[PDB]
Design an enzyme around this catalytic site. Structure first.
Site, short mmCIF file in Angstrom:
data_model
loop_
_atom_site.label_atom_id
_atom_site.label_comp_id
_atom_site.label_asym_id
_atom_site.label_seq_id
_atom_site.Cartn_x
_atom_site.Cartn_y
_atom_site.Cartn_z
N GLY A 175 -23.57 13.78 1.10
CA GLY A 175 -24.03 15.12 1.40
C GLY A 175 -24.29 15.33 2.88
N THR A 176 -25.03 14.40 3.50
CA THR A 176 -25.34 14.53 4.92
C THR A 176 -24.06 14.54 5.75
OG1 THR A 176 -25.55 12.14 5.24
CG2 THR A 176 -27.50 13.35 4.54
N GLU B 33 0.11 15.16 22.23
CA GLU B 33 1.46 15.05 21.70
C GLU B 33 1.46 14.52 20.26
OE1 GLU B 33 4.28 16.09 23.08
OE2 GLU B 33 3.20 16.88 24.82
N1 GTP Z 1 -15.59 2.60 4.41
C1 GTP Z 1 -16.91 2.63 4.25
N2 GTP Z 1 -17.49 3.60 3.46
C2 GTP Z 1 -18.83 3.63 3.28
C3 GTP Z 1 -19.64 2.68 3.89
N3 GTP Z 1 -20.92 2.94 3.56
C4 GTP Z 1 -20.94 4.02 2.75
N4 GTP Z 1 -19.66 4.46 2.57
C5 GTP Z 1 -19.24 5.62 1.77
O1 GTP Z 1 -20.20 6.65 1.88
C6 GTP Z 1 -20.40 7.28 0.64
C7 GTP Z 1 -21.81 7.83 0.51
O2 GTP Z 1 -22.34 8.21 1.76
P1 GTP Z 1 -23.59 7.40 2.36
O3 GTP Z 1 -23.21 5.96 2.64
O4 GTP Z 1 -24.74 7.46 1.39
O5 GTP Z 1 -23.96 8.14 3.74
P2 GTP Z 1 -23.83 9.74 3.90
O6 GTP Z 1 -22.39 10.17 3.79
O7 GTP Z 1 -24.39 10.16 5.24
O8 GTP Z 1 -24.72 10.38 2.71
P3 GTP Z 1 -26.33 10.32 2.69
O9 GTP Z 1 -26.77 9.09 1.95
O10 GTP Z 1 -26.87 11.53 1.97
O11 GTP Z 1 -26.87 10.26 4.10
C8 GTP Z 1 -20.10 6.22 -0.41
O12 GTP Z 1 -19.47 6.79 -1.53
C9 GTP Z 1 -19.17 5.25 0.29
O13 GTP Z 1 -17.86 5.42 -0.19
C10 GTP Z 1 -19.06 1.70 4.69
O14 GTP Z 1 -19.78 0.86 5.23
N5 GTP Z 1 -17.70 1.67 4.86
MG MG Z 2 -26.04 8.28 3.75
#
Ligand code: GTP
Ligand code: MG
Ligand code: GDP
Lengths: 50, 430, 439, 186, 50, 95, 244
Positions: C144-145, C254
């Site tokens: 969400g964030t 490009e």
């Molecule tokens: N490739 C990769 N994806 C990640 C990693 N950590 C989290 N994710 C992805 O991020 C998604 C969820 O988002 P969050 O890690 O909780 O961080 P956010 O997008 O800011 O969301 P919030 O927790 O509300 O702050 C998960 O479904 C993961 O697929 C990572 O270290 N590497």
């Molecule tokens: Mg997060």
């Protein structure tokens, strides 16, 4: 269920209750013909009651 | 930052809270005198979530102890780690509820509730930015099940956007210690479902079954049940207090676990639980943790999970472990048990990782799952309640101080309404 | 003279920013303290770091980066790390409360209180630059964030700067591997938000990277750090054409001239080769022909998509090392003669090749070995319709029963906001098939 | 398919009074329902499309894809009952250049933007039964500044009541409109 | 199940499997309602909801 | 065939060869802390008692777990994974 | 009752060769040998759409009482009730809940007298029907819980008349939405995808899905401003009607 609707319930779902009872089996004596899947499965119970 | 405040009521609530605070104190390295003798720097970075700093450099929990009889708090103060609590937070009456929900909600609770609201208002206003409240109480008693629900109603009215989380001890029929358990249980559930944001149900029978089977210890006491409950409830906020691969506070869990607002009753479980003599032989790995977690007997409730379909489930992992393994295990169990998972909510498993394990474990897991099997618990409670209420037995005590049978009738009808609306989503299809 | 700014939003963005900035510091020889050692100079020339760093005038250097979050845990991890003195202390903007995977919260409730400071810091970073090239934004799309803050930031920088290039590197949820239960919702909302606001998008699904790590790197329990390291390697390979001399240079501007046939179609998937462990890296030639054959392997795609299910539209080559144009031409001829890969009829040639001389930089404590030749796979194909189609059905199952909609409604977002996002997805899908048909 | 065929003043594609109102139309339903019922407001039979998930439930003018439903008529008009809920429709258009354009009108949308393939447009519905005259002449002339030669498809989504679709070829009023195309006031 | 199969002129294994499927009437009982009256002769077993 | 330590306490995200080297070059997996013989006489020599118990009854009966748990070493993943240069050179191999 | 003789019903193609004791999987451990499929619990279906076993109604007793002024008059084509004493004189506080309790009844004439008695009661009442609203909540939840199409179908028509009969009734019903709405959610989408052919059932309003939608429609306009949010809280599928 009157002990007979149970038979349909078991026979309705072969995957849930797999086994040899789902299909007809030959008899041990050639005189007796093999019974229906439902028919052969009642006649076992009448023997158990006796 | 994002701190929460603890409120415990009743004898059972105080017994839960004492062990919970003792466990948290050992987790954060705080001696019973309040002096920090920890060894890791991470033990104090996020201490403000639960603790307040006082002059002289000691730490005090922000726990408000509420009861209608001074007997139990004199016992909890004299116990180990009983000096942590601020003596000004103790609030009590001199009469008692007598296991009467009406007396603990209308006559005596109303006149005493002003002081507890004053002290909790001070505690909530002092902190920088509140995150939520947590309540521990039992639904089988008078003062707890009544006064705690009234307090939750007041706090919800004054704080609309905060998170309210409560732990419920529900009276099972097999092991019952009070003859009037169904009455106040139904009356309290009526208000609890309306007010609480999150609720968790604990059954004493399930605790005894777990202690006798998994731990295989001869003579359980109320200390062990409190220990299990405290560990399970600390596993919820471990990820809030500590870093992790996937941080997830209390608010994040609620969003992913409550699909519709009226369905916020969950059952919990903790893993691993092993006997003392068999610890040299087991190999602690993620698949072992998952297979012990999804076990029916591991759950903290009499409700049997295979009698209904899991709406959503959540798993919280403590300690350091690889992300791929957890996801693969979750997918594996979801695919292997497709019958018990509802089909219009795909990927209905939530997983979070916290890198700091509990004291004494290399790995640990807390399980929170929303299953439609809790409808059996509500059904069995109502049957006893209507059985006693048809003949109007044990009714004059409650109706002697301003209640009428219409309130009981509407409380019973509302509980059946919850059962119907909760089993409605079990059989829904796409 | 050329500068870019990296914007990391969300936990995933911050965690991948850590790895990419560590890689950049090691590649340019800057110590974690920010001070280049007086002795032991590893890189010749001047102002190579000028693309990514800024000189304070006397002493250390500061990255042209800014970190955004609403929850302070990872921000404090960065601030108490081994890079505390690396970053400017007030450009690590940390919020107070987490949106808890709520796109409406991250777009209507708490992101607005921070977006003003975000844009202020962005301006204070941008006005320093003079020949600015573009912005790089990193964000996990299933959060969400990340989704809400990225949507707001792209919306604001679209009108504040206008035509300036922006590159988005999303991380889509896997077809069957997932961590949350509501990621299709905010994923669709974020796609709607960024469809008209970004210039280039890259697909970075985690399942494909897991598969790459398992098969090639010989890792049986990979974690997020390895994925972030490979993503950082991809970004470094993409950006090496800016700060290093080469036979055939390629600029960020490009890309729309070579890889974007139509404004609506700018989503594309990546891949990288070679990916081998040191235990078996030295036993083979690592020739350009075999590395480019491995690059076109459908199993080596960085996203869980099958290029064999669609036609290829555009494909950009970036080689760094001791590659030769004649060998590259021979490899391209071989790939063209191959039958398994088919292009569209209205595109006779769809290959653009870039050559760089600097070999990829190895990282101690990592997994990759030292190789001369590496190729970055950047291609746009019609096969990416399946990832949109599958999440569309993932959305409908929950949306038919009004599942989890009240949490978004109560945060100021209207109930009908989902419908136009669904329409945009449907129109995008029809566009892909409309382009893919022959004449 | 309405090609090499005569049309002068009006040409109907759908009409709710008949043995089978829709042969050429194709129906796709996920959670909705389609039926033909009489209306209380107008004492006549009207087709029904309803259901949640507006996007998934719809009916397409051609039975199958990969062919053209070609018609030269410039003016379009429909008869729709306002249910005070979500409703939308699309039309597929061919311009001077051999490329196709989409025009969208949405009940719940409040913004419009022009794209090379899709040109969305908000629309407003008054209470009760009403008729909407879709010009299709200035719409292609304003959004893309290109003349119109041919329009291919028309698509109607869920949650609406449909009486008649026909092409007017020009702005028409009630008196010159023949009675069967007129909606008689109750 | 030996003498039962002997009287029924069936194999011993099929009768045992036939018994096992019927013993899985608890699944029919676990679901709500589904009243039962298992007579098979002298003794009648009546099962209400639970 | 059976790299010894890799199963019980699972090794983290890293190359199989590197973790195998780490868990083979580590101490233990040998040596006689109790000086026991596999033939079966030092069994009668030895005592077989764990010194990690106390007592019970009338208050609390769970007991703390065996020493098969970490302590003090509690430390986040980012601390391990991301350090700058203080490691063994991956390509040193003295000549 | 009839039941075919079980010892006679037979099958033909199945061959009567008997393996007997000449068997055994020992010594033949091939990888293609069959395995057991263990019994698995079937999918739970619960009792969401099961019958409710309609409870006893007090109206039947109160008709046997001979203390309700009402008589079945057969002078018309359809039987029409005649009021011995005009309903305006009756106490709506006492009688109106009783007539609502008769909606459950199915046996003639208890079913017949209930609906006709109620319609006259609401139609003739002008202002004193409002105070009885709190006492009417118990019967309406009981009948709707019966989960039977006919009883539900007829009484939703009763509910529509109650709101429209007089003013201010909708406003007072707003706090009581929580006790009656949950049934509406279950049958909200209970509609038939007939397709193209004519549905001849318009004459008899027996379609549950359409009835619920229009009943909720009347609730919003008369309920007031607060009515809509209460409905949306109770049922998630609902959409605004008065709002543009
Ligand atoms: N490739 C990769 N994806 C990640 C990693 N950590 C989290 N994710 C992805 O991020 C998604 C969820 O988002 P969050 O890690 O909780 O961080 P956010 O997008 O800011 O969301 P919030 O927790 O509300 O702050 C998960 O479904 C993961 O697929 C990572 O270290 N590497
Ligand atoms: Mg997060
Ligand atoms: N887990 C746990 N449950 C307890 C303990 N003591 C009492 N209970 C439960 O609490 C119930 C009685 O609650 P009660 O003491 O009357 O609540 P109160 O009136 O609010 O103090 C009993 O059914 C017990 O099962 C305890 O120490 N631990």
């Amino acid at each position: 269920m009157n002990l007979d609707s149970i038979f349909e319930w078991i026979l309705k779902q072969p995957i849930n209750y797999p086994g040899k009872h789902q299909d007809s089996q030959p008899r041990t004596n050639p005189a007796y013909k093999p019974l229906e899947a439902k028919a052969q499965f009642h006649i076992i119970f009448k023997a158990t009651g006796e | 930052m994002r701190e929460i405040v603890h409120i415990q009521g009743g004898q059972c609530g105080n017994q839960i809270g004492a062990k919970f605070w003792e466990v948290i104190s050992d987790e954060h390295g705080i001696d019973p005198t309040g002096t920090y003798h920890g060894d890791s720097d991470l033990q104090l970075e996020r201490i403000n979530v639960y603790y307040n700093e006082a002059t002289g450099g000691r730490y005090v929990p922000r726990a408000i102890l509420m009861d209608l009889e001074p007997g139990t708090m004199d016992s909890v103060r004299a116990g180990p780690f009983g000096q942590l609590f601020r003596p000004d937070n103790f609030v009590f009456g001199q009469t008692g509820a007598g296991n009467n929900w009406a007396k603990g909600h209308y006559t005596e609770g109303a006149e005493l509730i002003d002081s507890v609201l004053d002290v909790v208002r001070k505690e909530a206003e002092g902190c920088d930015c509140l995150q939520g409240f947590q309540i521990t109480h039992s639904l089988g008693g008078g003062t707890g099940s009544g006064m705690g629900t009234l307090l939750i109603s007041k706090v919800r009215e004054e704080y609309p956007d905060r998170i309210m989380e409560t732990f419920s001890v529900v009276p099972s029929p097999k092991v019952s210690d009070t003859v009037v358990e169904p009455y106040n249980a139904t009356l309290s559930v009526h208000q609890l479902v309306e007010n609480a944001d999150e609720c968790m149900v604990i059954d004493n029978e399930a605790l005894y079954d777990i202690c006798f089977r998994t731990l295989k210890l001869t003579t359980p006491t109320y200390g062990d049940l409190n220990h299990l409950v405290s560990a399970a409830m600390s596993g919820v906020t471990c990820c809030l207090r500590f870093p992790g691969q996937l941080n997830s506070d209390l608010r994040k869990l609620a969003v992913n676990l409550i699909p519709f607002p009226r369905l916020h009753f969950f059952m919990i479980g903790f893993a691993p639980l092993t006997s003392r003599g068999s610890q040299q032989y087991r190999a602690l790995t993620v698949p072992e943790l998952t297979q012990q977690m999804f076990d029916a007997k591991n759950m903290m409730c009499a409700a049997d999970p295979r009698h209904g379909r899991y709406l959503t489930a959540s798993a919280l992992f403590r300690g350091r472990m690889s992300t791929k393994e957890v996801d693969e295990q979750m997918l594996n169990v979801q695919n292997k048990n497709s019958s018990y998972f509802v089909e219009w909510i795909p990927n209905n498993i939530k997983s979070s990782i916290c890198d700091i394990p509990p004291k004494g474990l290399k790995m640990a897991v807390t399980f929170v799952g929303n299953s439609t099997a809790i409808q059996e618990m509500f059904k069995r409670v109502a049957e006893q309640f209507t059985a006693m209420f048809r003949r109007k037995a044990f009714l004059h005590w409650y109706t002697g101080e301003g209640m009428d049978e219409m309130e009981f009738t509407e409380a019973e009808s509302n509980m059946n309404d919850l059962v119907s609306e909760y089993q409605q989503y079990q059989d829904a299809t796409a | 003279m050329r500068e870019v700014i990296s914007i990391h939003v969300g936990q995933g963005g911050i965690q991948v920013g850590n790895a990419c900035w560590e890689l950049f510091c090691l590649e340019h020889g800057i110590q974690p303290d920010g001070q280049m050692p007086s002795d032991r100079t590893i890189g010749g020339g001047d102002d190579a770091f000028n693309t990514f760093f800024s000189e304070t005038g006397a002493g250390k250097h500061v990255p042209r980066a800014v970190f955004l979050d609403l929850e302070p845990t990872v921000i404090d991890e960065v601030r108490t790390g081994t890079y505390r003195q690396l970053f400017h202390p007030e450009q690590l903007i940390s919020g107070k409360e987490d949106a808890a995977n709520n796109f409406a919260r991250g777009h209507y409730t708490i992101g607005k209180e921070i977006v003003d400071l975000c844009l202020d810091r962005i301006r204070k970073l941008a006005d320093n630059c003079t020949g600015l090239q573009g912005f790089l934004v990193f964000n996990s799309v299933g959060g969400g964030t990340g989704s809400g803050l990225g949507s707001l930031l792209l919306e604001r920088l679209s009108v504040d700067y206008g035509k300036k290039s922006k590159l988005g590197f999303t991380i889509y949820p896997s077809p069957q591997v997932s961590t949350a239960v509501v990621e299709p919702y905010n994923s669709i909302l974020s796609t709607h938000s960024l469809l008209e606001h970004t210039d280039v998008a890259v697909m970075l699904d985690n399942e494909a990277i897991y598969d790459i790590c398992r098969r090639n790197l010989d890792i049986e329990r990979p974690t997020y750090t390895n994925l972030n390291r490979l993503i950082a390697q991809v970004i470094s390979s993409l950006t090496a054409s800016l700060r290093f001399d080469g036979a055939l240079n390629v600029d960020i501007t490009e890309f729309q001239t070579n890889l974007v046939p139509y404004p609506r179609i700018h989503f594309m998937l990546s891949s990288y080769a070679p990916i081998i462990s040191a235990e078996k890296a030295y036993h083979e030639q690592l020739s350009v022909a075999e590395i480019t054959n491995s690059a076109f392997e459908p199993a080596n795609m960085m996203a869980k998509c099958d290029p064999r299910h669609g036609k290829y539209m555009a494909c950009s080559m970036m080689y760094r090392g001791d590659v030769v144009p004649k060998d590259v031409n021979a490899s391209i001829a071989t790939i063209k003669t191959k039958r398994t890969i088919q292009f569209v009829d209205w595109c006779p040639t769809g290959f653009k090749v870039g050559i760089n001389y600097q070999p990829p930089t190895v990282v101690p404590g990592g997994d990759l070995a030292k190789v001369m030749r590496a190729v970055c796979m950047i291609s746009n194909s019609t096969a990416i319709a399946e990832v949109f189609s599958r999440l569309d059905h993932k959305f409908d199952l929950m949306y038919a029963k009004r599942a989890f909609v009240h949490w978004y409604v109560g945060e100021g977002m209207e109930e009908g906001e989902f419908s136009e996002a669904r329409e945009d997805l449907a129109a995008l899908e029809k566009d892909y098939e409309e382009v893919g048909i022959e004449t | 398919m309405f090609k090499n065929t005569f049309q002068s003043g009006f040409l109907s594609i759908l009409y709710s009074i008949g043995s089978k109102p829709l042969q050429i139309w194709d129906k796709s339903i996920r959670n909705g329902h389609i039926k033909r019922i009489t209306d209380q407001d107008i004492l006549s039979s009207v087709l029904e499309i309803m259901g949640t998930n507006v996007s998934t439930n719809y009916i397409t003018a051609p039975a199958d894809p990969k062919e053209t439903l070609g018609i030269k008529l410039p003016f379009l008009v429909m008869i729709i009952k306002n249910l005070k809920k979500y409703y939308t429709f699309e039309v597929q258009v061919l311009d001077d250049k051999n490329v196709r354009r989409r025009f969208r009108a949405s009940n719940y949308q409040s913004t419009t933007r022009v794209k090379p393939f899709i040109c969305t447009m908000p629309m407003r519905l008054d209470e009760g039964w009403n008729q909407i005259q879709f010009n299709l002449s200035d719409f292609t002339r304003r959004a893309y500044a290109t003349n119109y030669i041919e329009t291919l498809r028309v698509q109607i989504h869920a949650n609406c009541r449909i009486r008649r679709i026909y092409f007017s070829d020009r702005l028409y009023s009630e008196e010159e409109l023949p009675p069967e195309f007129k909606l008689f006031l109750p | 199940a030996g003498p039962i199969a002997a009287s029924c002129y069936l194999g011993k294994d099929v009768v045992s499997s036939a018994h096992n499927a019927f013993i899985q009437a608890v699944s029919d009982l676990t679901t709500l309602g589904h009243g039962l009256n298992i007579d098979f002769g002298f003794v009648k077993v009546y099962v209400q909801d639970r | 065939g059976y790299i010894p330590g890799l199963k019980p306490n699972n090794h983290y995200g890293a190359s199989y060869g590197e973790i195998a080297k780490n868990c083979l070059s580590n101490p233990k997996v040998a040596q006689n802390p109790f000086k026991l013989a596999s033939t079966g006489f030092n069994y009668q020599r030895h005592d077989f008692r764990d010194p990690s118990l106390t007592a019970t009854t009338h208050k609390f009966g769970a007991q703390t777990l065996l020493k098969n748990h970490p302590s003090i070493d509690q430390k986040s993943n980012q601390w391990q994974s991301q350090t700058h240069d203080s490691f063994r050179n991956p390509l040193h191999k003295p000549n | 009752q009839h039941a075919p003789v079980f010892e006679d019903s037979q099958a033909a193609t199945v061959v009567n060769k008997f393996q007997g004791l000449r068997q055994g999987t020992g010594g033949k451990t091939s990888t293609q040998l069959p395995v057991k499929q263990p019994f698995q619990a079937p999918n739970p279906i619960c009792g969401a759409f099961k019958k409710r076993t309609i409870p006893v109604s007090e109206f039947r007793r109160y008709y046997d009482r001979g203390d309700l002024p009402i008589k079945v008059d057969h002078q018309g084509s359809v039987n029409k009730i005649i009021w011995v004493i005009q309903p305006d004189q009756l106490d709506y506080h006492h009688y109106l809940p009783i007539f609502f309790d008769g909606l459950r009844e199915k046996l003639d004439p208890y079913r017949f007298l209930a609906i006709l008695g109620t319609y006259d009661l609401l139609e003739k009442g002008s202002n004193k029907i409002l105070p009885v609203i709190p006492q009417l909540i118990i019967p309406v939840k009981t009948a709707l819980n019966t989960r039977d199409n006919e009883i539900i179908g007829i009484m939703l028509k009763i509910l529509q008349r109650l709101v429209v009969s007089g003013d201010m009734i909708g406003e007072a019903l707003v706090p009581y939405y929580r006790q009656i709405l949950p049934i509406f959610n279950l049958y909200k989408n209970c509609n038939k995808n007939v397709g193209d052919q004519i549905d001849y059932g318009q004459r008899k309003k027996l379609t549950l899905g359409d009835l619920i939608q229009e009943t909720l429609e009347l609730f919003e306009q008369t309920g007031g401003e607060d009515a809509f949010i209460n409905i949306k809280y109770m049922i998630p599928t609902y959409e605004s009607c008065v709002h543009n």
